Amino acid sequence: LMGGLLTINPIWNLGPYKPSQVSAGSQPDFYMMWTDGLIRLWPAWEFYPFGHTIPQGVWVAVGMGLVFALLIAYPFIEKKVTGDDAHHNLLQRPRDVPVRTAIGSMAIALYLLLTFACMNDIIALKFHISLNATTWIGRIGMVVLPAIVYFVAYRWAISLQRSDREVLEHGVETGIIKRLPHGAYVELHQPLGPVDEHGHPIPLEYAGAPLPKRMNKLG
Amino acid sequence: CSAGQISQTTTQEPAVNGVNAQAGQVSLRNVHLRAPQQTDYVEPGTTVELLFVAANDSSNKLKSITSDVGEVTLTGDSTVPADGVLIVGEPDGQIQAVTAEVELTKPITNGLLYDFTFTFEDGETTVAVPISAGEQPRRPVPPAGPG
Amino acid sequence: WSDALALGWPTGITPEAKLNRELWIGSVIASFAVGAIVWGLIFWTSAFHRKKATDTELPRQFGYNMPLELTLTVIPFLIISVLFYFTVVVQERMMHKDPNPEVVIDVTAFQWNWKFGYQKIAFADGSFDYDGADPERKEAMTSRPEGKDEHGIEKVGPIRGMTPEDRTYLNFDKIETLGTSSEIPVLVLPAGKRIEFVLNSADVIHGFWVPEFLFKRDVLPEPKANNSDNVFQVSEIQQTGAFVGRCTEMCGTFHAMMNFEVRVVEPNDFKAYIDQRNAGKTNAEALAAINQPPLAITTEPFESRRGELVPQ
Amino acid sequence: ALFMRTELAMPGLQFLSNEQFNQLFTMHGTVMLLFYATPIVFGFANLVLPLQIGAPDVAFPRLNALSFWLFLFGALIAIAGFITPGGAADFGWTAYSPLTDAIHSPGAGGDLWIM
Amino acid sequence: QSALLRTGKQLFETSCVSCHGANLQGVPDRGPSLIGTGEAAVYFQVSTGRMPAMRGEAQAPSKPPHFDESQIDALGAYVQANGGGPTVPRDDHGAVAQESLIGGDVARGGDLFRLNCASCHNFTGKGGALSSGKYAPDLGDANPAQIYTAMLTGPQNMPKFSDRQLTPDEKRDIVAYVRESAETPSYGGYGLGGFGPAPEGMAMWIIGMVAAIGVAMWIGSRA
Amino acid sequence: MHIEARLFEILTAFFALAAVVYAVLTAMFATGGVEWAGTTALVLTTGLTLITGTFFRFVARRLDTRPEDYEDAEISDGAGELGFFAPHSWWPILISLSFSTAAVGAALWLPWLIAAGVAFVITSVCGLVFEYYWGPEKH
Amino acid sequence: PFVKMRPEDIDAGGMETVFPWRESDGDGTTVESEHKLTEIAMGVRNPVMLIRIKPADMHRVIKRKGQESFNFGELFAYTKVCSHLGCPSSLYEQQTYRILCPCHQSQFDALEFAKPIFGPAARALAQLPITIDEDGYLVANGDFVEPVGPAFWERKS
Amino acid sequence: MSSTQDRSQLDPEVERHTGVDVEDVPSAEWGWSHMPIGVMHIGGLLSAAFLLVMMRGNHVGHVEDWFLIGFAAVIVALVGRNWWLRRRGWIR
Ligand SMILES: CC(C)=CCC/C(C)=C/CC/C(C)=C\CC/C(C)=C/CC/C(C)=C/CC/C(C)=C/CC/C(C)=C\CC/C(C)=C/CC/C(C)=C/CC1=C(C)C(=O)c2ccccc2C1=O
Ligand SMILES: CCCCCCCCCCCCCCCC(=O)O[C@H](COC(=O)CCCCCCC[C@@H](C)CCCCCCCCC)COP(=O)(O)O[C@H]1[C@H](O)[C@H](O)[C@H](O)[C@@H](O)[C@@H]1O
Ligand SMILES: CCCCCCCCCCCCCCCC(=O)O[C@H](COC(=O)CCCCCCC[C@@H](C)CCCCCCCCC)COP(=O)(O)O[C@H]1[C@H](O)[C@H](O)[C@H](O)[C@@H](O)[C@@H]1O
Ligand SMILES: CCCCCCCCCCCCCCCC(=O)O[C@H](COC(=O)CCCCCCC[C@@H](C)CCCCCCCCC)COP(=O)(O)O[C@H]1[C@H](O)[C@H](O)[C@H](O)[C@@H](O)[C@@H]1O
Ligand code: HEC
Ligand code: HEC
Ligand SMILES: *C[C@@H](COC(=O)CCCCCCCCCCCCCCC)OC(=O)CCCCCCCC[C@@H](C)CCCCCCCC
Ligand SMILES: *C(=O)CCCCCCCCCCCCCCC
Ligand code: FES
Ligand SMILES: [Cu+2]
């Protein structure tokens, strides 16, 4: 359906490659837009040793060699860091492991930044921004937005934990009844495990499962 | 940040050949040399014509000599600008009276800049005037034999 | 006392402005006579502190005082009723709409500067059989017999049959005191005549606001179509000299750069102004011909440059 | 407003330009009227009005989150004229129509202001 | 016609002399000079709509036109009589020629558009970004006479591809290309813009990959 | 209830009074004619308070005295079970992101972003309105 | 395909792309041509933009070393292949005078010498010397003084 | 009500002693849940140092260096506040 209904790589609209004519986009396919977007954002640091030249393109040749060496060898990295010397078969929900989800969301948002400042050209075209401004937005974003998304990701994973660690100590939330002889408002929680003789149940323990937070999703 | 203070629109030049000259109280815009350029240089003795406007910012109207090199002649209908223009001649396709023109006595070519000194009642300005043409398209180059 | 109590007006130069300034003086006397007794109420009910000897015993606790409420719902209605009657009796004296003016100025008001008209003069002293030109009012009524299709439509125009880019309201004149960006437009007006102002803007709403007329109006783009009685007469102008005139809506960026002047000259100076302009002279020459400084004297034509940190 | 008032302290254009000033009072008048006052008149409502009428919650308790988040994401996309190179709306908060139609103030910031 | 010059002057006085000084000069740091630019320049800069403008910004963008074809000839002949330069090409009716400008070749126009300028815009003539806020605009809403007078007198940041830089055969040839590249439909599907891989990526994710993950969550359960 | 019907009846009386007096005072006394731009705004703000007050009067007639609304009512007279309020929900943030994408497509005139933002509006509005109606997964 | 060039062709504020044609490899009407002639169109380090700076802006120019006479009045010839990573920098902005590249959006100053104003480039994009020939045609006054394409190890001594 | 309980015996583990307690984060034994905090302090400080090194380049617009000073001073202020509060035990 999307090979028929949507054009892709219209090479007749493009030209034959002659080395004196370009587009304005000149952007690669999206899975490699993080690479030369990293060219578009690395701030022109060249070195000049005794009679030679290290250009900018060394850095991303280091940098693509950097990220891949972090993306191949990550399980050994956090096997060294954490201490996971155990045969794990059950998964862990991505809220149950907040710094690893947060390092991952650093990597996701850094990819989204290096991509979303590789269509730098056509973003500044359509979404009317100065082109210098959006590549500075990328050039600061690859330094500060992983820190912002690490903070938001780590504390958001912990608050997703706490949001389904209060659905056990309390019930599952529903519509409101008032208490009869006085004026109160209880949310009429529906418990998930065994109940005691009064308004609170036996609080269950966590088990790595998605606990349902809507009585809707119950029967 | 691109909005006002150093704008990329009002800090511009018009896309035209001749230079401007704000100085000397005469607003002097698009001064160029119409010179049909036949060879490497245009040979000495060839009469080629200097074009500008001389707008007034008020009356400065005198046009004393305005000569650096090339024996600039003028026309007596020169006391025009009283907060107004001084259109010299037709620059390029101006279809609708001061034949300002130079007798070179120095080889000039297109692409260069030549220092002309326009003197007025208020002062003089050196402009580094260009060679221009809003002419017909290029004279036909001989097609080269292959080899 | 009369200038400082009036919250610092500029004093009037037309009887319109004199009577408007008298009503503002009376109305700030009314506003300070309300605010003085009510600030007296606040800064005297701040003498009802929590007393140190006041025991565990609450105040009078009253609320709900109906006759006092009727008195202070009737007395502000009396204040606004007498202020509304004085407002309407000064609203009668803002445009008397005299069909026999003495000089009509066609103040058109384009993007970021002014242009003054001198559409018609007629002295009751007896002078100036002068009129407006009108060959220049040609239309953009796009009554082409056929458009992009081939038959039937004969499309006439967007608004009322014509294009928006029309300019048929925009009346012109032989005399035109055009205002460039380095020379402030100088209207000159005879002292002690009936000076009508017909107001048009070529592009965008702004305001013909002389500060010392104590009056303004907005130059709406097509004011006859937009129910806008743009025209207003000014009854006299006693004081001669030069008077600033600002621009008092929003035009776009170069909006403080739209100042003008209404220099009020003697009637024989008005004679020697236009009779030294019918023989065609520009603004500085016509003002030099009547022994009066030609450039704008109460506002300089300030900088064509953009800031004090732009490199010239 | 402090930028505007640094600007008005001296008769020159000493600090920032003309056009940036005309963007400045406009975005200022909106994020004091339509993005500071106009939200807080329901912000104190969401504070203490169900507390004052005895309500357990506010009546449409997702649509109040929808009100707040539509407010914040109208406010960010109206401040987002400053990212644009010509800047935000130079016409005033009053935004009179021969100045706002796309012949006049043609930039992207006025459109972002509108939506 | 001298009355046409007077009409150009009447429209000139009441739209621009806050930024062109009314002697066709340049008001310094508020609007540049205007002589020598000519009738072709004023046709492109008012027929597109751009120059009856409202702020001096990164670049003055496109807008609806502030005058019509019965008045652009007046305004352009007025600026050519005060100055003088390139003129707009006109057919055997005296009006502005817009259909006689499409040249008899397209492939030469394709190669010449592609070499000489499509660095700035795009292959098919969509917009492209430029340095500090300025940007190339789309060529889809472009009258062919505006395209010829766009390359003939380059308004803002584009080189003026002159009568001698590109010959009028070549310029008619380029406007033959762009009026049949921004007009021909995208062969083989929706045209995700004209520039390829970034819209193709963003329409891979939310159209294709979001549908793929939605199918994958309808088929598999969750636990 | 009773008093909302009286409240919007007061607003209806004043809005209709102001609408008809603005129409008949701009019929005369104006420059060209009726203004037609605050006149119909006043006629339809009369329509606004007609709809609200007419519905509240329809409810207030088809009802007894509400145990809420009754003056001198003990809390135990009206202490039952209220209806469903929604607990925690992450759909309104998605409503706002969807409607903001549609709005910045309608601001920066990007028709692809208009269509995509409207598609996200439909998707997130479905996610809000079905949120307490999705049954369990049937496997 | 290659028409010989005069200074009167390009005018004020104009980018124009020039190629190193010679009198030997003539028109494309012989098979010994179109292979000395498409070799020019296929070689990477051949395209040179021919800038014609508006002569009101010739006081803003400051040349660099060994390069003061590489103008021709107001004709500059900067290469089209950029400083780093070799894309043709065929975007040119008059009235701001910046050679902008498309591939990574690196500006260069057309006025002084093509120093990078902004972008990921750090080297002056190379300038070609210009003279006019006998019969008044634009010719190159020698080679570039530096290697013209993208950077690599053996450079800058 | 149509749900069962959930019981998962994982391989629980440093081994449950040093890190974060199960009341700071509500599930610390279920995965790796504490970055050592000198890493994020020096990461923020090195981020701000990198933003300050980013002045060195092809550069004429000094309106950017105020953004770099600003986003570096914000990160230095957050890192310094955070380290000062842990040096005083979250006081003021
Ligand atoms: C998981 C994570 C990568 C951790 C790996 C470990 C990490 C420490 C290794 C080091 C990596 C660090 C140092 C540098 C980052 C470089 C980066 C990771 C390059 C590697 C390539 C690869 C692994 C990229 C990451 C994976 C990718 C981003 C996951 C997709 C995001 C999510 C989780 C999937 C669901 C999204 C799906 C439902 C569609 C939603 C729609 C959204 C708007 C899509 C976002 C989006 C995307 C993601 C585009 O790529 C894109 C490209 C072109 C145009 C537009 C878009 C676009 O809108
Ligand atoms: C999906 C929603 C995304 C929302 C993101 C919203 C963006 C956040 C705020 C952005 C502020 C942008 C202000 C830019 C305003 C500007 O134009 O400034 C320019 C350069 O400033 C800058 O970029 C510095 C600002 C950098 C911002 C810091 C980045 C923060 C990170 C966290 C945001 C990344 C978000 C990326 C999202 C990707 C997805 C992630 C999940 C000056 O250069 P320039 O204009 O070209 O030159 C001048 C002449 O024009 C002018 O005439 C002359 O006068 C001189 O001034 C001259 O220098
Ligand atoms: C069912 C039976 C089988 C029939 C086949 C169905 C397959 C479709 C192909 C059939 C031919 C239609 C393609 C037309 C030919 C074509 O190419 O489509 C243009 C693209 O234009 C536009 O966008 C406007 C279109 C707006 C419509 C809605 C947009 C589509 C959305 C839904 C795409 C989603 C993308 C993902 C969103 C990302 C999410 C973000 C959060 C529209 O042409 P047009 O409007 O007339 O003019 C052009 C000028 O748009 C153009 O700016 C100008 O430069 C010229 O190109 C001119 O020709
Ligand atoms: C098996 C080991 C793995 C290495 C694989 C490749 C190594 C192959 C070496 C074989 C050749 C050895 C020298 C003879 C080959 C030769 O003569 O050329 C050299 C060509 O070797 C190169 O490519 C690369 C090395 C260049 C020599 C020295 C490089 C290593 C040291 C010096 C760098 C480390 C210390 C400096 C800083 C280190 C990093 C940061 C601190 C240098 O180029 P160049 O110097 O530009 O000379 C030009 C003439 O070519 C041309 O004719 C003529 O026209 C000339 O004008 C000129 O252009
Ligand atoms: C914003 C106030 C303003 C308005 C109104 C205005 N001009 Fe412009 N003019 C400018 C500015 C600013 C530029 C800068 C764009 C440029 O020169 O590249 C300019 C440039 C031009 C150019 C391009 C010069 C060139 O070399 O390409 C033309 C043509 C032009 N103006 C004509 C007109 C015409 C005709 C009118 C209608 C009477 C008009 N302008 C209205 C200020 C204005
Ligand atoms: C920076 C290099 C640059 C290149 C080279 C260039 N353009 Fe332009 N083009 C622009 C810019 C910038 C504008 C907008 C100018 C303005 O708004 O005043 C523009 C305007 C236009 C427009 C008007 C679009 C509209 O909506 O009316 C068209 C058509 C156009 N160019 C086509 C061309 C043609 C034809 C060529 C020559 C073969 C060309 N471009 C070369 C940058 C460039
Ligand atoms: C011309 C420029 C002015 O620039 C200058 O002249 C000097 C530069 C100022 C120095 C910058 C200091 C800022 C430090 C950052 C601290 C931020 C708070 C903490 C962040 C971690 O004009 C401009 O560039 C003005 C800048 C425009 C500002 C746009 C405001 C944001 C708009 C919005 C679309 C951004 C998306 C979301 C932002 C956060 C939303 C929270 C709810
Ligand atoms: C560039 O063209 C923009 C022109 C106008 C810039 C004026 C900026 C004023 C301050 C805006 C503040 C926005 C939020 C900043 C958070 C501290
Ligand atoms: S490719 Fe043009 S500079 Fe990097
Ligand atoms: Cu104004």
Automatic annotation (TrEMBL), chain A:
Regions that span the bilayer: 57-77, 97-116, 136-157
Superkingdom of origin: Bacteria
Protein name from the UniProt record: Cytochrome bc1 complex cytochrome b subunit
Subunit structure comment from the entry: The cytochrome bc1 complex is composed of a cytochrome b (QcrB), the Rieske iron-sulfur protein (QcrA) and a diheme cytochrome c (QcrC) subunit.
Described purpose of this protein according to its UniProt entry: Cytochrome b subunit of the cytochrome bc1 complex, an essential component of the respiratory electron transport chain required for ATP synthesis. The bc1 complex catalyzes the oxidation of ubiquinol and the reduction of cytochrome c in the respiratory chain. The bc1 complex operates through a Q-cycle mechanism that couples electron transfer to generation of the proton gradient that drives ATP synthesis. The cytochrome b subunit contains two ubiquinol reactive sites: the oxidation (QP) site and the reduction (QN) site.
Localization per record: Cell membrane
Organism, scientific name: Mycolicibacterium smegmatis (strain ATCC 700084 / mc(2)155)
Residue sites binding heme b 3 per the record: 9
TrEMBL record, chain B:
Lineage of source species: Bacteria, Bacillati, Actinomycetota, Actinomycetes, Mycobacteriales
Coiled-coil annotated residue ranges, if any: none
InterPro entries reported for this sequence: LpqE-like
Protein name: LpqE protein
Protein keywords: Heme, Iron, Metal-binding, Signal
The keyword Metal-binding is assigned to this record: yes
Organism: Mycolicibacterium smegmatis (strain ATCC 700084 / mc(2)155)
Pfam family, one: PCuAC
Residues that coordinate or bind heme c: 15
Disordered: region residues: 132-147
UniProtKB/TrEMBL annotation, chain C:
EC number(s) from the headed UniProt entry: 7.1.1.9
Gene Ontology MF terms in the entry: copper ion binding; cytochrome-c oxidase activity; oxidoreductase activity
Spans through the membrane: 24-47, 68-88
Protein residues bound to Cu(2+) 2: 206, 247, 251, 258
Protein residues bound to Mg(2+) 1: 218, 249
Organism this protein belongs to: Mycolicibacterium smegmatis (strain ATCC 700084 / mc(2)155)
Cofactor annotation: heme
Region of interest (Disordered), residue spans: 134-158
Membrane topology: Multi-pass membrane protein
SUPFAM superfamilies assigned: Cupredoxins, Cytochrome c oxidase subunit II-like, transmembrane region
Keyword Manganese annotated: no
Name used for this protein in its record: cytochrome-c oxidase
Binding of Cu(2+) 1, residues: 206, 247, 249, 251, 255, 258
Keywords noted in UniProt: Copper, Electron transport, Membrane, Metal-binding, Oxidoreductase, Translocase, Transmembrane, Transmembrane helix, Transport
Binding positions for Cu(2+) 3 per the UniProt entry: 206, 258
InterPro entries: CcO_II (IPR045187), CcO_II-like_C (IPR002429), Copper_CuA (IPR001505), Cupredoxin (IPR008972), Cyt_c_oxidase_su2_TM_sf (IPR036257)
Disulphide-bonded residues: 247-251
UniProtKB/TrEMBL annotation, chain E:
Domain Cytochrome c span(s) in chain numbering: 3-83, 104-182
Binding annotation for heme c 3: 20
GO CC field: plasma membrane
Keywords linked to the UniProt accession: Cell membrane, Electron transport, Heme, Iron, Membrane, Metal-binding, Oxidoreductase, Repeat, Respiratory chain, Translocase, Transmembrane, Transmembrane helix, Transport
Domain of life according to the entry: Bacteria
Positions that bind heme c 5: 20, 51
Subcellular location: Cell membrane
Binding site for heme c 8: 50, 121, 156
Residue sites binding heme c 2 per the record: 19-20, 45, 117, 120-121
Residues reported to bind heme c 7: 50, 117, 120-121, 156, 158
EC number per UniProt: 7.1.1.8
Swiss-Prot/TrEMBL catalytic activity: a quinol + 2 Fe(III)-[cytochrome c](out) = a quinone + 2 Fe(II)-[cytochrome c](out) + 2 H(+)(out)
Amino-acid positions noted as binding heme c 1 in the UniProt annotation, renumbered to this chain: 16, 19-20, 156
Membrane-spanning parts: 202-220
A single GO molecular function term of this UniProt record: heme binding
Modifications made to the protein after synthesis: Binds 2 heme c groups covalently per subunit.
Membrane topology (UniProt): Multi-pass membrane protein
Keyword Lipid metabolism annotated: no
Primary location recorded for the protein, binned into one broad class: membrane
Binding site for heme c 4: 20, 45, 156
Protein residues bound to heme c 6: 62, 121, 158
Binding site for heme c 9: 121
Subunit structure comment from the entry: The cytochrome bc1 complex is composed of a cytochrome b (QcrB), the Rieske iron-sulfur protein (QcrA) and a diheme cytochrome c (QcrC) subunit.
Protein name: Cytochrome bc1 complex cytochrome c subunit
Protein source organism: Mycolicibacterium smegmatis (strain ATCC 700084 / mc(2)155) (Mycobacterium smegmatis)
High-level lineage: Bacteria, Bacillati, Actinomycetota, Actinomycetes, Mycobacteriales
Gene symbol of the encoding locus: qcrC
Full-protein interval shown: 72 to 294 of 294
